Design a protein around this ligand. Structure first.
Ligand SMILES: CCN(CC)C(=O)C[C@H](NC(=O)CCc1ccccc1)C(=O)N[C@@H](C)C(=O)NCc1cccc2ccccc12
Ligand SMILES: CCN(CC)C(=O)C[C@H](NC(=O)CCc1ccccc1)C(=O)N[C@@H](C)C(=O)NCc1cccc2ccccc12
Ligand SMILES: CCN(CC)C(=O)C[C@H](NC(=O)CCc1ccccc1)C(=O)N[C@@H](C)C(=O)NCc1cccc2ccccc12
Ligand SMILES: CCN(CC)C(=O)C[C@H](NC(=O)CCc1ccccc1)C(=O)N[C@@H](C)C(=O)NCc1cccc2ccccc12
Ligand SMILES: CCN(CC)C(=O)C[C@H](NC(=O)CCc1ccccc1)C(=O)N[C@@H](C)C(=O)NCc1cccc2ccccc12
Ligand SMILES: CCN(CC)C(=O)C[C@H](NC(=O)CCc1ccccc1)C(=O)N[C@@H](C)C(=O)NCc1cccc2ccccc12
Ligand SMILES: CCN(CC)C(=O)C[C@H](NC(=O)CCc1ccccc1)C(=O)N[C@@H](C)C(=O)NCc1cccc2ccccc12
Lengths: 223, 223, 223, 223, 223, 222, 223
C-alpha cells in the first residue's frame, strides 16, 4: 500500500494505489484506499483491509453525527483528535496483527490564509499525530520511496494540476520499488485513486485525468 | 520467483522471471534464475539467491568434472541423483532459512525416441525427486498460477515456438497473480530468461524473441 | 473445500464441492456447502463444518428477521455488512481453529442494469470484504486452482448454461489439484451443488444438469 | 500413500498407488512406490519421498552386493534383518520428520512348500518387523482401509491373477476413503503399480492388466 | 469403544460394545453405551464415560421436556440441533480430555416415505453434524474397522434382521482389530447392546437374539 | 551508515559518511567506511565496525596475496566471488548480531568497453551478490533515501565531477532522513570520504573538493 | 529527545529539542515537546509522542479544571501530586512500551523568597518525584549529556538571559552526542523550543531569540 498527500496553493491532494495482497499473493486490483470522510476531509489508510474500511466508515459517521447533533461541524483540530482517539482505541488489536494507520488530508475552512489552509496529518499505531509543515507525506509499505521522490519533485508544485502529477508520480516510484504497491495497469485500465480538496470541498479526481498523467510519466521514462 | 519448464516435440523449454525481493522491497530487476548447467541440461532455482546460485554453479562444475575425469558425461538419471544429493546436503541450512529448490530440464541423448527425449525433474527440500510425465512443471511462489495456466494452454504446444510462447505466458499469469514474480518491464526492456534444449544442445533464447512474445501476450489481453 | 461463483448475463451462479475430511480421511461424500440464504442470495462457506453451517443458518435467519420486522429486505450493501460483522465476531474462535470463510453471491433487485445485477463478494477472516468486479471468485483449499481455471474459461460465458458449465469445470480443476476438494463421483452419482440467481430468484440447479455437464467435461478431457 | 501385499497359492503380489501430496495439494500423479529389490523381492515404501526412494535404492544395492561378494544370495531372514537395521538406522531422522516405513514382499526359494513360500513382512519406525502369516498386509495412510477390505476379499484369492484383482481393489478402497492415496485415473490412464513374485522371480505386472482390472472394479460398483 | 448404526428398509439399527477401560486396564465388562433417548430415537456415545452418560441422560430429558411443554415432540431436525448444541457446549471441557462424541439414530415419523424414514446423524467435537446418506456410520476407536466392514456387508441388508446381523458383525470386526472395543464374551454371557427403531418405535433387542447372531458369526469365522 | 556508489562515463565513484553509533549515542564522528582494496577496486562496508574493518583488511590482504602468489591479479569476477565467500563465512556470527554488508566498486581493466567498464556489486548477509546494471547503488541504514535521491539526480551524471557531486548529495539526503547517517559537520570540518576509480586506478578524493561540494549543496537548499 | 530546565534568579526556564524518530528514521523536525500547562507551570515530556501529548493536554485541563471549580489554583505541591498520579496511572501501559516521563518547571507564587521561587520536579515511571535542589535537570535520551554540560555551565547563570543561553547550549551538547536529539537546523530555521517563567507568568521564548543564541554557540564552537 502507498498513500500520498501533498499541499498545493489553495488546497490539498491525496492519492493511493489499488493493489491488495494476502502475503505475496495479489488478492485485489481495484480496491479504494482513499475516502472522502466529509466535505473538507479525505482519509487514506494502510494496513488490514477490514480495519481500514472500518476506520473510514466509522469516522465519516462520527463527524457527520457531531454536525447533526450540534448544528456545526467540528473544528479541524477536533477532527484530528477524534481520528487519533479511534486509532488509539484499535491499538490492542493492532498489536495482535489488525494494524491500520491513516493519513488525513483536509482543508481548514477557519484557517486565516485560504491558500495554505490545506492540512496533512499523519498518525502512528498509538494515535500520536503530526501536522506536516513540510507540505507532503505518505504512509504504507512504499511510503519511503514516495516521500523521497516527492522530496525531489515538490518544487514543481505550483497549482492543483501540477500537484496531482507529483502525487501520481510519487505513487509510481513507490510501486516501482515496492511489490506491495500497485502501479498503473494499462491492460486493465486501473489507476491510482485521487481526491482533491480546496475551498469548494472534496472531490474525486476523475479516472481519465489520472490515466493521462500515468501515461505521461511512463512515456517520460521510456522515450 | 517463478520457474517454468515444458516439453515440446523434440525438445524442452525453461523460463524464469527477473525479480529479486527482500520482504516487500524490490531488490533486483535483472537477475538470472535459469542457468545452462551442461550442454543438455538447464537448472532454474527458486529460493534464497545465494544458495540458488551456489547450486547452479556447483552443479555445473560437478557434471563437467565427471565428464573430464571419466571421458563421458553422466547418464541423465545420474545427473538427477547428483542434484538430489546436493539438495539433500543443504537440508540443515534449508531449515534455518537458506532454502532453495531447483527445477531440472534436460534432453536425454540416450532416449529411444528423439522426440520424447525431453525431461523435466522436480525436487523438494529433502532431495526427493519426480520426473514429470505430464509435460510441464513450475516452482516458486507463482508456480501454482503458472501450472494452472499451462494446464489450459498446453494443448497448443506443437513445436519449439509455441512451447516457448506457452512458457512465457505462464510466467505472465504467474507475475500477474504473485507480487514476488516479475512480469515484463516494457519501460526498461527487461524480460524473462529462457533456455531451449533439443538434440543440437541447449541455447539461451535471446531477449528480443521473448520481448516479441511478451508484447504479443499483452496486446492479446488488451483487444 | 472449493466454492466458486461467477456472474453471467442477467444473473449469478455459485457451486460447491461435496467432500468433507478429517485430516486425510474422507469423512463425507455428499456434503452441501452452498446455501440459499434468501430469495435473492446464496452463501457458500469453507472451513470447519460446525462454524460454516452455523454461519449459513444464522445469516438466513438474520436477513429474513429484518425483512419481517421492517417490511422490506435489506439493501444488498446491508446484507454484505451483516455477513462481514458476523465473520468478524468469530475472529477469536477462528484463531483457535474454528475458522470459516463465506463467499456471497446475490442479485441486487435495486440495480439499474439488469444484465450486471449479479454480485459476488469475498471475505477474509477479519471480515474485510471485496465486491469482485472481474466476474468470478472462489474460496477454499482449491480456490486458487479454480480461479486460475476460470481466468482462462470465463470468456466462454454467455448465459446461465455456459456459466454453470464453466463453474463446474472450475470445480473439476480444483478437485483435480486439491485432495481436500471432491470431484464428481460417477460411481455414486454425487455431483457438486449449484445455485442460480436471476430476477426470478434463487433456485437450486437440478442434480441431473450438473451430472450432464460433468460427463461432458470428463469426455472432453479423455479424448 | 497405500501399499498392499498378499500371499497367493504359489506366489506373492504387491501393489501401490501413484499419488504424491504436499499437504492437501496433489504434487504428483505418476510416482512409483513399489520397487523390485532383487530377483525374488519387492519393497514398497510410504512416507517422505526422499527417504522412501533412498530406502529402496540402498536396500537393492545391499542385497545384490552381498550376492556378488559371496556368490550366493542372502536367506530371506537375512534380507529381513538388513531392512530392519536400515529402518532402525533412520529412526533419528524419522523422529525429526523424515519418516518412511517399508513393506517387504518376497518368495523364499529355500522354503519346502512352493505354495506357502510367499512372505509378507511389515516394519515399524524402530525396525521391529512381523512376518504376516494371515496372508496380507498394507502400509501407508490408507493401510487400515486396505487391510479391512482385504479381510473381506481375501477368500477370493486363488491364483496370482485373482490376488492381483484383490490387491488393486484394496487399493481402490484405500483411495476411496483416504485423500492422500490416489485411485485409478481413467482420464489420464494412470493406475497403481504391481509386482508379482513366484518361483520364476519377480516381474512388474503390465499396465494394461491393472487397467482392465480397475475398470472391472469400477463398472462392478456402478452397474 | 465402537458404536455402529445402519439404515434398513423401513427402519434403523444401532449397536454398541460393552467394554470400559482406564488406559490398558479393563474397568468394565457390561456397560451400556447405546441409549433409547425417546420413543423414536436412540443415541450411542463414545468417549469419557461420565460425559457420555450425562449427554444421553440430559438429552433424553431435554426431548421429553419439550414434548411435555409443547404437547408435541420436536421435529427430527430439531432433535439434531439440540444434540449438536449440547456437544458444542461441551467443546471446552473436551479439549481438556472430557471428550464425548454421539451417534444419533432415529425414525422420522414425519417423513414422506416411511420405508426410507430411517436417519443416522454423526457429530464432531465442535457440534458439526452430518445426516448420513450412505446408509451406515460408526464412532469410537474401532469405528474405522467397523465402517470398512459395513462397506462390504451392507449390500446384504434387506430388512431388520439382516441389518442387525451386519451391525453385530461390524462390532465383531471392530473388537477383532481394536483392543479398546470388547467382543462377545461367551464365558460371561456378555454381548453388545442393540436398539431397533421403526414406525412402531424404538426397542432394545433382547440379549438372546444378539447372542444368537454372535455365535453365528463366530462359527462362520471358524469352520 | 550510508555508502553510495555510482558509475560515470569512464569510471566509478564511491562515498561514505563518517558517523559511528552505539544505539542512539554518537560514538564516532570521523570514521572511514570506504577503503581502497586494490589499485582498481574500493569497498565500503555497513554494519558492526569490527566486522566491517576486518572485511576490508582481510579482503585487501587476500587480493594482494593471490596477486603475489600467481603473478597476476584476480579477474573481477573472482574478486566478487572472494568477497561473497567471505560474507557467507561470516553468516553465523551475523545471525548472532555481528552483521556487516559490503558494497564493491571497481574498474574492470579486462572489460570490452573502457567507457562502461565501471562495476558496482552489492551483497547480502548470505554472500549473494548482484551486479547493478542501473548505474548506482547504496548500502546502510540510509541507503533507501540515497537510492531514491539518485533515482532523480542520476540523469545529471556526465563526468567525474558531476558524479562525485551526485554521490555527495545522495549522502546528504541520507543523513537528512536517517539519524544513523552523519551529514557534513561544518563546525568540525568533517565531510564524507570518497574514492574515484578510472583507467588510471583508484584514488582518494581529496577532502577540499568534497567540502566545497557539500557547501554548494547546503547553500543550494537554503 | 532532550528536555532541560534550570532555575535562574527569580525564575525558571525549560527548553526542548524538535526531533521525532521511529527507530533510526527521523519522522519529525518541528515537534513541540515543552508545553505551558498553566500561567505558572510548564511541562516537557520525553517518550512516546501519543502519551507525552496526552499527558500535557490532560494535565493542563486538570489544573484549570480545579481552578474553575474551586475559584483558586492548586498549591504547587498539589500540582506535583496530580502529575505524579497521572504518571503512576500510566505505569501499566508504560510496561508494554507506551512510556513517557515528564519534567515539570514552575514558579511558586506562594513561595517565601521570590528570587528562588523557581521549582523543578522530575518523575519516574512509577510516579516517584523529586524536587531538584541543585538548580537544573533534564529528561530524555540526551539528558545525561545535557546534565553534565549544565553541571559545568550553571555558574554562568545570573539572570533569565544567561539561563536561556545555558539551556540552549545544553541542548546543543545533547544533540551533539545523541542522534535521537535534534540540534539547530540552520537550513530549515528550526530551533529548540523554550519557555520562561517568572512572577509575571509563563511565556514562550520567541524563536528569533533562540536562533540568535544558537548561531552564537555554533560560531563559538567553530571560530
Ligand atoms: C478486502 C478483503 N480481502 C479480500 C477478501 C483481502 O484479501 C484483504 C487482506 N486480508 C488479509 O490479509 C487477512 C488478514 C487476517 C485477519 C485475521 C486473521 C488472519 C488474517 C488484507 O487486508 N491485505 C492488506 C495487506 C492490504 O492489502 N491492505 C490495503 C488496503 C488499504 C485500504 C483499504 C483496502 C480495501 C480493500 C483491500 C485492501 C485495502
Ligand atoms: C542478489 C542478492 N540480493 C542483493 C544483494 C538480494 O537482495 C537477494 C535476497 N537476499 C535476501 O533475502 C537475504 C536474506 C538473509 C539470508 C541469510 C541471513 C539473513 C538474511 C534474496 O535472496 N531474495 C529471494 C527472495 C529471491 O529474490 N530469490 C530469487 C532468485 C532465484 C534464483 C537466482 C537469483 C539470483 C539473484 C537474485 C534472486 C534470485
Ligand atoms: C459434519 C461433521 N463431520 C462428521 C462427524 C466431519 O467430519 C466434519 C469435520 N470436523 C472436524 O474435523 C472436527 C474439528 C474439531 C472440532 C472441535 C475440536 C477439535 C477439532 C470438518 O469440519 N472438516 C472440515 C475440514 C470440512 O470438511 N469442511 C467442509 C465443509 C464446508 C461447509 C459445510 C460443511 C458441512 C458438513 C461437512 C463439511 C463442510
Ligand atoms: C517427489 C518429490 N516431490 C515433488 C517436488 C514431492 O512433492 C514429494 C513430497 N515432499 C515433501 O513434501 C517435502 C518434505 C519436506 C522436507 C524437508 C522440509 C520440509 C518438508 C512428499 O514426500 N510427499 C509425501 C506425502 C508422499 O507423497 N509420499 C509418497 C511416496 C512414497 C514412495 C515413493 C514416492 C516417490 C515420489 C513421490 C512420493 C512417494
Ligand atoms: C465410569 C466407569 N468407570 C469406572 C469408575 C471407568 O473407569 C471408566 C473410565 N473413566 C476414566 O478413565 C476416568 C478419566 C478421567 C476423569 C477425570 C479427570 C481425568 C481423567 C473411562 O472413561 N473409560 C472410557 C475410555 C470408556 O470406556 N468409554 C466408553 C463408554 C461410553 C459410553 C458409556 C460408558 C459407561 C461406562 C463406561 C464406559 C462408557
Ligand atoms: C569500534 C568503534 N566504536 C568505538 C569503540 C564503536 O563504539 C562502534 C560500535 N560498536 C558496537 O556497537 C558494539 C557491538 C557489540 C558486539 C558484541 C556484543 C555487543 C555489542 C558499532 O559497531 N556501531 C555500528 C552501528 C556502526 O557505527 N557502524 C559504522 C561503521 C561502518 C564501517 C566501518 C566503521 C569503522 C569504525 C566505526 C564504525 C564503522
Ligand atoms: C508524532 C507522531 N508520529 C508521526 C507518525 C511519530 O512518528 C511518533 C513516533 N511514534 C512511534 O514511535 C510509535 C511507537 C509504537 C506505538 C504503538 C505500537 C507500536 C509502536 C514516536 O513517538 N517517536 C518517539 C521516539 C519520539 O520521537 N518522541 C519525542 C516526542 C516527545 C514529546 C512530544 C512529541 C510529539 C510529537 C513527536 C514526538 C514527541
Amino acid at each position: 500500500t502507498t498513500i500520498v498527500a501533498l499541499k498545493y496553493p489553495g488546497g490539498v491532494v491525496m492519492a493511493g494505489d489499488r493493489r491488495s495482497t494476502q502475503g505475496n499473493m495479489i488478492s485485489g486490483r481495484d480496491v479504494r484506499k482513499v475516502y472522502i470522510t466529509d466535505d473538507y476531509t479525505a482519509t487514506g489508510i494502510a494496513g488490514t483491509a477490514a480495519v481500514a474500511v472500518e476506520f473510514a466508515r466509522l469516522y465519516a459517521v462520527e463527524l457527520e453525527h457531531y454536525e447533526k447533533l450540534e448544528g456545526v461541524p467540528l473544528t479541524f483540530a477536533g477532527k484530528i483528535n477524534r481520528l487519533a482517539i479511534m486509532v488509539r482505541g484499535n491499538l490492542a488489536a493492532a498489536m495482535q496483527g489488525l494494524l491500520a494507520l491513516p493519513l488525513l488530508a483536509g482543508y481548514d475552512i477557519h484557517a486565516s490564509d485560504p491558500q495554505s489552509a490545506g492540512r496533512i496529518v499523519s498518525f502512528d499505531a498509538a494515535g500520536g499525530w503530526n501536522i506536516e509543515e513540510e507540505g507532503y507525506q505518505a504512509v504504507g509499505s512504499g511510503s519511503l520511496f514516495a516521500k523521497s521522490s516527492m522530496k525531489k519533485l515538490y518544487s514543481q508544485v505550483t497549482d492543483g494540476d501540477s500537484g496531482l502529477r507529483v502525487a501520481v508520480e510519487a505513487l509510481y516510484d513507490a510501486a516501482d520499488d515496492d511489490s506491495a504497491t500497485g502501479g498503473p495497469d494499462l491492460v486493465r485500465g486501473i489507476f491510482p485513486t485521487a481526491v482533491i480538496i480546496d475551498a469548494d470541498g472534496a472531490v474525486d479526481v476523475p479516472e481519465s485525468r489520472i490515466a493521462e498523467l500515468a501515461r505521461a510519466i511512463i512515456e517520460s521514462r521510456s522515450g
